[PDB]
């Protein structure tokens, strides 16, 4: 049943889209010392999962911030400076976010190829015998 392939590729494409949006936010918030409520932005990362026990769909199970320390900068005249004159900025690393942009896009496009190829195989089964 190739219709299962559609579920797996669709779940993979959804997972890559979540990863791409996470990368988009990290690049946009790699220079933000402030935040909406009260907590400095930390590089977010989606968590993929495989519930192996046919096909095993890939599901995103939540967003987890990176555990790297916040990059402290000496801005003593800044309003938000601490007692030592340090301000903290998000731990977003440019090199790894660019790799995620490349990896997520290439992984997204190859799952479309599988679904398109799997779509053809179902059609040829319909034409079998006639």
């Amino acid at each position: 049943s190739l219709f299962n392939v559609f579920n797996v590729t669709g779940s993979a494409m959804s997972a890559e889209s979540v990863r791409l949006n996470t990368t988009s936010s990290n690049l946009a918030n790699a220079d933000s010392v402030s935040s909406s409520a009260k907590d400095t932005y930390k590089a977010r990362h989606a968590v993929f999962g495989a519930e192996l026990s046919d096909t095993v769909p890939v599901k995103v199970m939540g967003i987890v911030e990176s555990d790297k320390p916040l990059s402290a900068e000496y801005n003593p005249d800044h309003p938000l400076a601490n007692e030592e004159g340090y301000i903290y900025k998000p731990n977003v690393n440019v090199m790894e976010e660019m790799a995620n942009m490349i990896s997520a896009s290439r992984a997204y496009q190859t799952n479309v190829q599988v679904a398109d190829s799997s779509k053809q195989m179902l059609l040829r089964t319909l034409q079998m015998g006639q």
Partner: peptide
């Protein structure tokens, strides 16, 4: 569930007793 996962809801905080108290 995954530990440390972020939530998609405003982060209950301090000022405005309303959040500090209601679970």
């Amino acid at each position: 569930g995954i530990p440390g996962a972020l939530s998609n809801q405003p982060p209950a905080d301090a000022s405005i007793p309303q959040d500090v108290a209601q679970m």
